[PDB]
Amino acid sequence: GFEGGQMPLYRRLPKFGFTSRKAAITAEIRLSDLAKVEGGVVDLNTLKAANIIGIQIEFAKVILAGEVTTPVTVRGLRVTKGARAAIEAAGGKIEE
Amino acid sequence: PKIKTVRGAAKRFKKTGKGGFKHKHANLRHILTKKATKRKRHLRPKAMVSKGDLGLVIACLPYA
Amino acid sequence: GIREKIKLVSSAGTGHFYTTTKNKRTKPEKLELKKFDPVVRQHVIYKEAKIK
Amino acid sequence: TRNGRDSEAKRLGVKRFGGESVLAGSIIVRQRGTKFHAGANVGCGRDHTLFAKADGKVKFEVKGPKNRKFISIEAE
RNA sequence: CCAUAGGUUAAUGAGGCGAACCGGGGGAACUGAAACAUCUAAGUACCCCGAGGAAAAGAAAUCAACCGAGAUUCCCCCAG
RNA sequence: UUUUGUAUAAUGGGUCAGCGACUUAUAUUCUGUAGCAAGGUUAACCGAAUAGGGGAGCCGAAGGGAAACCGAGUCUUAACU
RNA sequence: AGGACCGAACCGACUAAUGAAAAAUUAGCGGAUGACUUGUGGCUGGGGGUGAAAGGCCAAUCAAACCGGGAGAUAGCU
RNA sequence: GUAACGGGGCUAAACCAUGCACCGAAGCUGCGGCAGCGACGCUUAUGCGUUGUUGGGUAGGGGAGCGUUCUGUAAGCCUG
RNA sequence: GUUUAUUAAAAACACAGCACUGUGCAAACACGAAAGUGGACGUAUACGGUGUGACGCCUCCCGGUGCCGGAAGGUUAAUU
RNA sequence: AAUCCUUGUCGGGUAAGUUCCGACUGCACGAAUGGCGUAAUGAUGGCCAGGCUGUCUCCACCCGAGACUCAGUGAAAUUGAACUCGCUGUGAGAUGCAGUGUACCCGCGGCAAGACGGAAAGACCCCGUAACCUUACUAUAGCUUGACACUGAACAU
RNA sequence: CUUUAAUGUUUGAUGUUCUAACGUUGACCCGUAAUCCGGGUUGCGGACAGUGUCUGGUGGGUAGUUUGACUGGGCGGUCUCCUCCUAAAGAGUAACGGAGGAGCACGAAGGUUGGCUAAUCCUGGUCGGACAUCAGGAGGUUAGUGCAAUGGCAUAAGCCAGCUUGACUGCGAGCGUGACGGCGCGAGCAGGUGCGAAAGCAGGUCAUAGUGAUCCGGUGGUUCUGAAUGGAAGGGCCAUC
Known part of the structure; x- marks a missing residue:
């Protein structure tokens, strides 16, 4: 980031x-x-x-990314709406 | 040795999803009352780095 | 640049203010205009105060 | 000498010419006065900048008693 | 005046040399910053004292985070 | 060799022989190539041992926002056609 | 008597022409009892010395000696 | 030093106009050869019939090789 | 008299003389982180610094910058 | 004048004097960074005269040392390669190009016009973001101010 | 509260004296064969002097540096922005080419509604004149534009008046112009306003100059963050200097 003596883009x-x-x-x-x-x-x-x-x-969120098939019990974790829905569909449980 | 990052560069730029770089616009820092409001408004949002000076930025920030 | 700058402050009791210029020699009296407060989202009276 | 000075060139002039299809918003002319006047579906900016208010073909024409140039947009 | 300083003997030890490494006492400038003064180079080069086969450090008035770890030293990560 | 331009009266070489200049290490990116592939790979170290262990870590599979936060969305804004 | 005079040694170096010589020669020239000259030994050290002062001299080197080190300084120049 | 046609020389071997010949280059054509890049189609050893076309080159970019010393292959192979 | 050893010997430096100025002795001043030493085993008819330069006849401005003296007021550090 | 204009003007000296000596609008003398005088002194600067002379008119001859030849020894700088001529052009000053002229091959003694001859990566000049030498900036030794410390006791205002 | 006196006690400084720190480069004695040094006695001085730490001043004594570029080197002039010409009828285009301006102004000189039309000359008219004000006409923008020049401007963008704050906040299809930093034009959408009967117009001014990146801070707002936790400080974000 030397541009001759002109003040460089970062500065x-x-x-x-x-x-x-x-x-x-x-x-x-x-x-x-x-x-x-x-x-x-x-x-x-x-x-x-x-x-x-x-x-x-x-801290850790569960995001709707990829896919879950087996039923899972997510405990003491944040879950997005979509992710939560997916989990539910799978047959899973969610709890704080 | 590991490449050192240009710390100033790091401070001033953030890398985006497609390998771009956002940055805050200049001219909205002081000497404001004289500037028209529209211009100021335009300045406010973060802006992508141009194709010309992209390379320099990249050089500055090897670890992104 | 004799014409000094000032800030019109919202009578709504919000922090919000506009800023502007005025000639304090020719116009001693305070500037009071009815400007839009964007926090209240209403047009309120704005009274001149010192820029500081 | 007392004479070295000049200003930056402003790149005024007709940007889109007769028949050029334009998107609404596009600037047809940059100019100082109203050398060209705004006709149908053309707006005139605060710096007399004529611009398309609708998508169509630019259409220059002389009109009125003063014989003034008027840029309109033909519908498309 | 007593004493003490001083004086003469006797015994024990020291002294000087040595590649690097080690701890401490002092400590630059060229150079980089496309100039330059903060800054950098660098606690580097160098000078000095001392030690050992290694030295230094070391047994929490330490971390941690409401869970816990458990002196120092060294290596890879953490992380440019 | 240097130059817009050199037979140049611009530079260098008396000749021969020998030597004489883009290297190396570690990071990073892109290309090729080989491996495996939503996975890939281990470092120190242990192991007389180029094996095998060692996955501590690193990169990737998610982004948006200054941040809290939200998350295939998100930021903006009281709210976005 | 004399920083007196003329003048060899001795100390110097104004003019001249000319490698044996990294400053000499020959021919003349100045001082020659003095602020003279000389032998031996001693002391002053580098931003330091010494200097009747020219930036002179300090080992054929001086507007900052030499030797070694930082050091492969740096060189947008050849 | 002739020295203001390159010279000899020229009364055209000068100038103007019209014409037809010839000379004239690394241009174009002819014959032979090599290489690059595209087309199509073979039917393949991943290149071949061909068929167009291209092939001056500094900085510089890209592609493909020769040779040198050393390690393996090599207690092999060559060599009084 | 001295001087640029090795392109300058002079009108340059020095000089006796003159003036200003500092210095009361553990002197001023100088070399020294300091101890100390020079000044000087001297003591204002002495020593240091500065300028001028035998001898003769001589030699307005204190506004500026320095130095010396003054301290009424203004301003003013650490400290509190 | 250790004064631009300037060889100022007048006088002296010379056949003729931008110098010298004497005098009369100080570009820009001047009183201890001394003024004006000054006997003596000076390898000091300037000017004039007598003497003297090869300094010169204008060179001549002679004596020695080299130079030349022979024998012995035996360097050096320089050097792209040379079969290394003149001229007029060209190309920015030609042995080398064009046109043309001249010229048998090779030494020796001489001369220095050219080989932009040899010598030293120009010393001038400029450039580039070294060195030494003021009321530039920034520091700082030294000198100096106060506060606290080493530092205590009375008495008064 | 204005202003002092009384009794009780408390810091600040000011000199005079003292003698015990400290000084002695006064004298004598001893270590000692010793002009050093120390100890002893003594005189003088004396809480000063002098040393340390902090502090203001002074400080080319010494050190480290800086001292711009363009330029048919220095000196002079210039360096950013706007207008015209050079510029070759799109844009752009150089010179130490030719000519001029800017570093602001304005709460109205902005918005909107309604209205109006200029210079100059002529003739007549009290003081009144080349030139005030008032009549009649010619003229047709030769005028005006807050300031240079250009291009504009009568639907006036020029001149008057009424009411006003759109010189609004969030955004912004799409364009222009720049190497980039950036600069510019913008219909429309949301909220909330002003003028108008309404259609509509208004996100400053006829337009093009009136300007300065980043860093470092300052002020106000904002629970975004808050190094064990709760706060706070500091940081961020928005506004602004």
Whole structure:
């Protein structure tokens, strides 16, 4: 980013935003990844064990992505509407 | 050694879904009362980086 | 640039303000215009105050 | 000397010509005065910029007693 | 005045040299920043003192996050 | 060789022989190629051991928003044709 | 008597023409009891010395000695 | 140093007009050969009949090779 | 008298003399992180610095910049 | 004048004097970064005279040392390769191109017009975002100010 | 509250004296054969002096640097923006080419509704004149435009008046123009307004100059964030300097 002596593109443009420390400990979980665990019950801990989310992860959503066939009990996790619907269809249970 | 990121660049740009780069417009920072409101409004939203200076940005930000 | 700048503040009691210029030599009296407050979403009286 | 100065060229002039199909919004002419006047389905901006208000073919024509140039849009 | 300083003997140890590594005491500039002064180079080069086969560090007035870990050192990640 | 342009009276070479200049390491991207493929791959280390273990991690399969958050949507805005 | 005079040694270096010589020659020239000259030894060290001062001299090197190191400084130039 | 046709020389071997010949290049054509890039169609060893066309080149981009030393193949093969 | 060793010996430097100025002695000043040393085993008829340069006849402006003295007021640090 | 105009003007000196000496609108002398004088001194600057002379008119001869030849020894800078002529053009100053003229091959002694001869990556000039040398900026040794510390006791205003 | 006096006690500073810190480059004694040094006695000085830390001043004594470019080198001039010409009838187009302007103004000089039409000259008319104001006419924009020039402008964009805040907030199909940063034009949609009987017009001004990226901060709003937790600080987002 040296443009002769003209003020380079980065320096021209204003800085913005801030980093969220809470974003680094959240996670997104596909529907496909609910089968990868064992026991048919999906906690954070379980996910971690199954190497789906990672050790420093306090929070995790389940997104409508891929597809779930087996019935699953999602526990202590956020779920999107679509994802939730999918889970229901599969024959699964959801709980806070 | 690992490539170092240009930290300023990182601060100023965010990579998008198709490998683009959004950025905040210039000219909406001070000396505002004189600027027409419409112009200001236009400036507000984030803007994609142009084809010309894309390369430079990329160079600056190897880890994106 | 003798003509100084000022801010018309909303009498709605919101923070909202417009900003503008005025010639304080020729016009000592305060500027009061009926401008649109976008927080209340109504046209309110806006009274001149110092830009600071 | 006292004479080095000049301004940036403004790229005025007829942008779309006779018969050119235009999308509504498109600028037909940039100009200083109303060299061309706004005719049917053409708007005149604050800087006298004539622009299509409808999708169609540009149509230059002389009209009225003063014999003034008028740009219209023919329907399409 | 007593004492103490000082003085003469005796015993024990030290001294000097040595590649790098190690801990401490001091500590640049060229250079980069397309100039330059903050900044960088770099606590680098160099000088000095001391040690050992290694040194230093080390047994939480430490982390952590309401769950827990359990001195120091070193390697890969974390992460440009 | 350098130049708009050199027989140039512009540069360099007395000749021969020998030596004499785009390397290497680590990151990153794109191309080819091989592997496996919604998966791919392990690092230190253990292992006298190029095997095998080791998946700590990394990249990918989701994005939008400054962020909380939402999520095939999302941000914008009181709300979007 | 004398920073007195003329003048060899000795110290110098104004003019001249000319490698044996990285400053000399020959022919003349100035000082020659003094602020003179010379032997031996000593001391002053680099932004430092010394300087009757020319940026002079400090080992044939001086508007900042030499040697080694930072060091393959940097070189948008050849 | 002739030195203001390149020279000899020229009264046309000068100039104008019309005409028909010839010379004249690495241009075009002829014959032979090589290579690139496209078309179609073979029926294949992934190239072949062909058939168009292209092939001056600095910076520079792309493609394909020669040779040198060393490791394997090699206690092989060549060599008094 | 001195001077650019090696293109300048001079009108340049020095000089006796003159003036200003500092310095009371643990002197000013200078070399030294300092101890100390020079000044000087000197003491204002002495020592340092600056300029001028034998001898003779001589030698307006304090607004500016310095230095010296003053301290009434304005402004003014750490501190509080 | 250690004064542009300027070889100022007048005088002296010379046959003739931009210099010299003496005098009379200070471009831009001037009083201790001293003014004006000044005997003596000076390898000091300028000017004039006497003497003297190959300095010169204008060179001549002679004596020695080299140069030349013979024998012995034996360098150096330079060097793309040379079968290395003149002229007029051309190409920006031609041994090398065009046209033309001249010229048998090779030494030796001489001369220096050219080979943009040799020598030193121009010293001038410019350029490029080194070095040394003020009321530029920024610091800083030193000097100086106060506050606290080492630092205590009385008494008064 | 204005203003002082009384009794009780409390910091600030100001000199005079002291003697015990501290100084002594005064004297004598001892270590000692010793002009160093130390100890001892003593005189003088004395809480000063002088040292450390902080602090203002001074500080080419010394150091590190900077000292623009264009330019038929320096000096002079220039450097951003707007108008015209050069510019070759789309756009664009150079010169130390030829000519001029800008670094604002305006709460009306903006919006809208209603109305109006200029310069100059002639003739007549009190003071009144080349030139005020008023009549009659010619003229036809030769005038006007807040300011340069160009292009515009009578449906006036020129001149008067009435009511007003659209010089609105969120957006924006689609275009123009730039290497980019950016700059510009914009019908329509939502909300809420003003003028008009209404159709409609209004997101500044006849248009084209009146301007400055980023960083760093400042002010107001905003629970977006908030390093154990609750807050806060700081950060973000919107507005603005």
